[PDB]
Write a protein that binds this ligand. Sequence first.
Ligand SMILES: Nc1ncnc2c1ncn2[C@@H]1O[C@H](COP(=O)(O)OP(=O)(O)OP(=O)(O)O)[C@@H](O)[C@H]1O
Ligand SMILES: Nc1ncnc2c1ncn2[C@@H]1O[C@H](COP(=O)(O)OP(=O)(O)OP(=O)(O)O)[C@@H](O)[C@H]1O
Ligand SMILES: Nc1ncnc2c1ncn2[C@@H]1O[C@H](COP(=O)(O)OP(=O)(O)OP(=O)(O)O)[C@@H](O)[C@H]1O
Ligand SMILES: Nc1ncnc2c1ncn2[C@@H]1O[C@H](COP(=O)(O)OP(=O)(O)OP(=O)(O)O)[C@@H](O)[C@H]1O
Ligand SMILES: Nc1ncnc2c1ncn2[C@@H]1O[C@H](COP(=O)(O)OP(=O)(O)OP(=O)(O)O)[C@@H](O)[C@H]1O
Ligand SMILES: [Mg+2]
Ligand SMILES: [Mg+2]
Ligand SMILES: [Mg+2]
Ligand SMILES: [Mg+2]
Lengths: 299, 298, 277, 300, 269, 235
Amino acid sequence: PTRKQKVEAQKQAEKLMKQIGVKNVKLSEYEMSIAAHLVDPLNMHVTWSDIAGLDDVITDLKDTVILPIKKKHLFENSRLLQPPKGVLLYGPPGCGKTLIAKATAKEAGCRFINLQPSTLTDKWYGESQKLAAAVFSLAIKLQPSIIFIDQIDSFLRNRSSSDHEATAMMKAQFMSLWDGLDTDHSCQVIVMGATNRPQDLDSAIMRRMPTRFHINQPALKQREAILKLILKNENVDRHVDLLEVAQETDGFSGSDLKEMCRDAALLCVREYVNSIRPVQQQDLHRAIEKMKKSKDAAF
Amino acid sequence: TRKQKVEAQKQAEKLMKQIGVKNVKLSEYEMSIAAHLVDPLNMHVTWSDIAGLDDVITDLKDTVILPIKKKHLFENSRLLQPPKGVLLYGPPGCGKTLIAKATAKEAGCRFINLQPSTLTDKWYGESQKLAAAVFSLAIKLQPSIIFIDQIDSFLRNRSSSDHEATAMMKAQFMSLWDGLDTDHSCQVIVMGATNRPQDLDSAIMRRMPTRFHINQPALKQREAILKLILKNENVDRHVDLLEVAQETDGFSGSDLKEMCRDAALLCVREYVNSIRPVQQQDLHRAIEKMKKSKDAAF
Amino acid sequence: AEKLMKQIGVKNVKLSEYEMSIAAHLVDPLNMHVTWSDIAGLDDVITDLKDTVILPIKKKHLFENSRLLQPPKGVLLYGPPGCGKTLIAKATAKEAGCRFINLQPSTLTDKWYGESQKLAAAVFSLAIKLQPSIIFIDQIDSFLRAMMKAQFMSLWDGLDTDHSCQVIVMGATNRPQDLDSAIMRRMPTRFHINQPALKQREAILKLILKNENVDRHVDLLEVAQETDGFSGSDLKEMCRDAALLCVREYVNSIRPVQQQDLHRAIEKMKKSKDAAF
Amino acid sequence: PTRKQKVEAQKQAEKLMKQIGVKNVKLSEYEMSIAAHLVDPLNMHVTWSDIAGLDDVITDLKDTVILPIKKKHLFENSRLLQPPKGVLLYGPPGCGKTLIAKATAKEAGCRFINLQPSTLTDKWYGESQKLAAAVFSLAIKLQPSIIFIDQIDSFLRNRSSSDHEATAMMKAQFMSLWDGLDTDHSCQVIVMGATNRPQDLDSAIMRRMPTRFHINQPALKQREAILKLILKNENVDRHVDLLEVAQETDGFSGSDLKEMCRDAALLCVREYVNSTIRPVQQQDLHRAIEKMKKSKDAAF
Amino acid sequence: LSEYEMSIAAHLVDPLNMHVTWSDIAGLDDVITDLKDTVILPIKKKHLFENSRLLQPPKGVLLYGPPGCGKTLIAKATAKEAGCRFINLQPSTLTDKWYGESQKLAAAVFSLAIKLQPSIIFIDQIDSFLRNRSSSDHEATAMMKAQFMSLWDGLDTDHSCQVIVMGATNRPQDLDSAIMRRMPTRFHINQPALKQREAILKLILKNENVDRHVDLLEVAQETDGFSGSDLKEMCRDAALLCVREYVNSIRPVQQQDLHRAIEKMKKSK
Amino acid sequence: MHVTWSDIAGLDDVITDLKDTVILPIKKKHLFENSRLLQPPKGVLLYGPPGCGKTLIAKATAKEAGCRFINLQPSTESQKLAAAVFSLAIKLQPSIIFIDQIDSFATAMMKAQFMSLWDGLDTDHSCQVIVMGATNRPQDLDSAIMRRMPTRFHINQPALKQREAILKLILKNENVDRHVDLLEVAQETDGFSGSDLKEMCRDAALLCVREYVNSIRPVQQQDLHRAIEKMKKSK
Ligand SMILES: Nc1ncnc2c1ncn2[C@@H]1O[C@H](COP(=O)(O)OP(=O)(O)OP(=O)(O)O)[C@@H](O)[C@H]1O
Ligand SMILES: Nc1ncnc2c1ncn2[C@@H]1O[C@H](COP(=O)(O)OP(=O)(O)OP(=O)(O)O)[C@@H](O)[C@H]1O
Ligand SMILES: Nc1ncnc2c1ncn2[C@@H]1O[C@H](COP(=O)(O)OP(=O)(O)OP(=O)(O)O)[C@@H](O)[C@H]1O
Ligand SMILES: Nc1ncnc2c1ncn2[C@@H]1O[C@H](COP(=O)(O)OP(=O)(O)OP(=O)(O)O)[C@@H](O)[C@H]1O
Ligand SMILES: Nc1ncnc2c1ncn2[C@@H]1O[C@H](COP(=O)(O)OP(=O)(O)OP(=O)(O)O)[C@@H](O)[C@H]1O
Ligand SMILES: [Mg+2]
Ligand SMILES: [Mg+2]
Ligand SMILES: [Mg+2]
Ligand SMILES: [Mg+2]
């Protein structure tokens, strides 16, 4: 027939499945096309120790998502002790969202799966809803599993009249398979999504993601912590305190400080090549000044 | 060729043996539609598990379940038959899917989930055949309850920016609902749960006249659901569910479940660091956490 | 063909395969318990439809030679959703004297090669073979908003000129504004099936409860003056809910429906009608 | 379906890929349709020497983008020394932006690719997101590469509610594939964009383009530099005071001085042809400046 | 030769059947002088100074002023005296009721213009098409009006193609800030102002009927106050009055019919 | 075309404007061929309300001026057929090419060839090949050749007196009552459209016929009033 571009998902999500260690899974063409976006747990290079600035959020996520997956002998006796069916990572953009997502993909346990909603929308009629169903079918087939939807503020957007029929049907099927009729059993299928704009997400999807973790912008202590974490392996001058830098920033996020340290290292490398030099804490001041002058362009 | 119905024919047979049908001869499309039949014994929720509202439950039981049984009493009257549509509308969360499961389990006749994703097909002239086979199967076994979850997305408001197959299916649904051959003594009822009935339709809205408003829980309903949830789990003796219900004032039927789950998780976390009941102190902390987290939209 | 010949009453069956497949689709006037007495409230529209379409079919001796009385090709019954359209169509299918046939465009779209123009030609060949015939396409808005569409349009425009076959295309419509630009013009006769007014509401309410054991002091005029916006199906649902509420006092352990049950049903229906707002 | 539009670019992207130097790259239909917009390195005829007026920006770009591409032995040990994942060239319209982009399309090494967001949007449903994914797929397939998004203040605009679902999905997928779950690894895939309205670009795309270069309106020294650069190939007299016209303009951008020089040359050719090669004697420049000022005044 | 290219080719005016020269445009003569040496001279005789990098015709010619009085007449005459392939489509031929069918249309237009020799492009009423960029407007034409700028002078442009785009507007104050940049040579088509009116009146009355002696200087200040296009429509009223009077009983014109046409045009206002 | 200019009543001023402008081609030489600006417009268009004598106006303009007419039939390779039709219409001079439903009518190459042929004909001859086939709704009909149709007239409801004249001209064909007058019916029609009076008279005749079929007589004022009331209720 037509649309036979699934001739390489089954040959692409099989060698990728052997890297995870699944023995006997009987899937269809749509299920394999969905599983073609599974992430390898060993392909990540960031653990919980690489995420600084916030500590209570890490422990909360670990005891809400990671803990109920293991120690099943203690959480299966009670009626309501299973992990939630949704984790909404909201807050300002930059620090925390994708890093916590990678930490959950690597060190959390059960098979992680990225959705990438671009593969759900198809050209042919009656093909996007089948893929949306195969998503949850594969999630149920692989217990447990964590369905990750990055930028969930666009795919599962607020419903209105100016929406395509296939996208609206997929958005309805998502909430009809989340906690629908034949769902809500002991399946350990959790759906998480990181988004910087949770104001216009939805009204029916917002309740299906009850555990909402606010990853705020780093404060003074958080900025000091992330500045001390970033300048750990690279050569830095012996007496360089990260408190004055974090106090001087006062508006930098977790990604702007990374750029500031990268700019300082690049300035040191350029000064060395013009003629291995450590950051004498003087380049940090001019880097902060240049970054502030650049950020002042939005106003 | 679309020769996958074979597997849909090997999944709509064993399930049939789980329901107890003896002689029902169907076609390929009818079998593919019946492949979504729900097992009544697979549900684990009855009318006793739905608290907070009682008049709505009694109304639904006397409107849907009561006409199904005692057919000798309603066979003489002309307008004493079950309706052809039940629209469960209201705010999202509490009541809709729970009442759907209760009607699937403890209501009687064979329940069927539509799952409109299977109606839309890639091949031309295949979605309308499945839409017809839906009602064909519904009439084939009487009675039956056709459930369409989130019906405000499949039978949307008819406009010009709609595909030919979807528009044809939406027209065939209302043509086979109360058209030229239906509306006889068939006892085929179609129900649907939705949280946005404002933009559902103009012709489908009248075909579902029995509309049950599953409102958002009030003080009494909040206390009722809080007492129902905290029933089997261990809790302190002097814990008044009225206090937390009056303090909340802003949760639906699903947010209180999350609050109780968070309280139990806090208890089991404080225990696992070194079985502890909730002393009504973790309840307030979970309520404050959920109230400070629900401000993400604003 | 022969499987459904029991009602056409003509031994002129020379149908082919497509004609045979289309012949299994005409309506069954036997199991149609609807006449002009069943439809209430709108009697002027009924008599208009009658003296416009019906006598051109039954009266076949006065106009026989050439006379101007002709069945208008294309009758569009348009209005709000409910209250009359399919009921009038079914009454016509019952007692129009002609072979009524339903379309249901879902059967036209064949999967093989996407060729659905052959069926669009076969349906018209069948309608002309056993004239008079009324081709009814329910929900004609979604069906006509594309080789089959042009072929069917040209067929309907070209074959209905010899005034030898009384084939008439009739359609019901709840959204007449977005129907079409040429189809709306192609149908000369348009019947506006309005929603029941203060008098039509009372008429249909009195017609709904006739054989039931209703109380003596139940003035339907008060119910009509209390509804103020109820459609045809809404009043039937209200009466059904009132009957269920009256029988609820007996099933829990035959009671005549009083005014209190009707008032409670009206209040419940008016509260429920605010779902779309 | 739409396999025709994707069967022509396939016969066009291959030839353009033959002269670039990609040896073995296996692409799909969407990847080939995206690669069909690759720019030829030899077609660009503007280098760093042809861009005057700004000097610190040039060396900053050479150290930030051009330097980490080569000499990989120095930036392979540390954790954060790779080239950035975005270069936002913001400033008033005129000088710098498109010229710097054209210069980097030739004198940067790695394969340059223009996005041309007009080809991303498609008529069929579920086709624009596939092309947006194929963009980054092709970028990762050949390393390194520079994805240029001209006038990025329109495609990756500020997210709101009055936007189409396809453009919103594409805008979300761009930032999801920029620094998402499987793209933070070292891949040398850099995305740059030139725009004249950075105030309403975005809140999540702005952080993904940390290196923000401001191309200001030419000042006195910059105006003198560009006026001396432009009046180098054309025939001019011996003595030309470039500071005079530079101080006279006081409001001309990098493109208005080019127009003034063109108008002076056209006046010279008109005076020559009217009789039947004449060098500008620093008098047609003042008249052209006055005419350009009168034209800019009468525009309102 | 794509599909959108062939769809655009339906608006490509043939360079042979134009029959519009500088003689048809009377009245204003200063704008014609500055446009001949700036647009026609660099386009033609390219074998003289092709070595120079900035001796090419400007790609941003724009003619503003009141509506009418020779706006597109100068464009057609220029394109006829220029190389070939006058290309005007519409102010609203684009913006089809689809998704991704408006920017691709402009892309096809520009590709077709690049395919052949300069092929002067004329965009009638660029004021509303390329209006000032903002964030409150519908976010479907802003991306299009930005792609137009990105394709006008971008990466692949600035070659020896001579592709010159010509615009037209009635109020170039809210047009743009980056589009006016690539439009450096902007001519000012003014109002006739008591002289060009008489000139165009003497021009139009040349190839016509008998037209007995009536000095155009007489009806020069008591004529239509503006809109020379209505002066083109004013002589039409005299012609219809001269051809509609003889049916009651070819007739030569005089001051009476012209004055009555003037009074009728004034009453129309 | 069997239509007559005197039969179609209504806007008498528009009729004279047509019989002057469009029939300047019917006028001999030295009147429209001598002056360059006195020639009639090339490619006249017609737009306005739906129906109301859309094709009837073109038929009357072709019959009164005696100009040759030919049906374009846009519903019935395409570019070649269009070029052949244009050549056939331009050969037999003078001739008018009338099209049906031009508002919704390779097609682009055919339109470009037709526009080029019309431009060449106008540059060669004054009014040899005319084109009058534009339908209603010309605001967004098409954008193929805008300069081809620069002349048009908004044919709408002229006035109540024109409606009364049309009713008197259309009703004076069958048997009518003495007291029943078309002016008395138009005084109560309250601004009915052009095609509305014909359908109202048809409904009155159908009522008068049904009066005998239910039990032939001439139409009366009561039947006309009932038909007008039914048309207003159905309007
Ligand atoms: N706690 C942290 N420890 C180390 N690095 C951090 C931390 N927080 C942020 N970062 C830096 O931020 C970058 C990741 O940003 P990320 O991808 O999470 O943005 P995002 O929040 O996903 O963007 P958006 O809000 O648009 O989705 C990494 O390069 C990392 O160096
Ligand atoms: N009366 C009740 N008794 C017990 N639990 C309840 C009650 N009402 C709601 N719940 C809780 O709500 C959850 C079910 O939510 P449900 O699936 O009905 O949401 P929904 O209304 O279907 O959402 P949407 O409106 O988006 O379709 C269950 O987990 C259940 O614990
Ligand atoms: N005049 C009437 N008298 C009695 N019952 C009526 C009348 N009109 C409508 N009904 C009731 O309405 C129901 C039929 O609805 P109806 O056929 O009018 O809907 P419809 O207009 O065909 O729907 P759609 O607009 O989708 O075609 C019947 O069950 C009948 O009981
Ligand atoms: N430093 C320079 N050296 C030489 N030429 C220059 C310089 N700066 C600007 N120019 C001139 O400017 C023109 C390029 O303008 P460009 O396309 O960069 O405008 P832009 O800023 O991209 O416009 P927009 O902001 O609308 O995208 C070239 O023709 C070039 O001659
Ligand atoms: N000075 C003039 N000399 C000769 N003809 C003129 C003159 N001014 C106007 N006309 C005539 O008036 C007509 C319309 O004038 P013009 O082309 O200036 O309008 P326009 O502003 O281009 O209209 P639009 O804005 O719709 O494009 C032309 O056909 C032209 O023949
Ligand atoms: Mg992210
Ligand atoms: Mg639900
Ligand atoms: Mg109906
Ligand atoms: Mg630019």
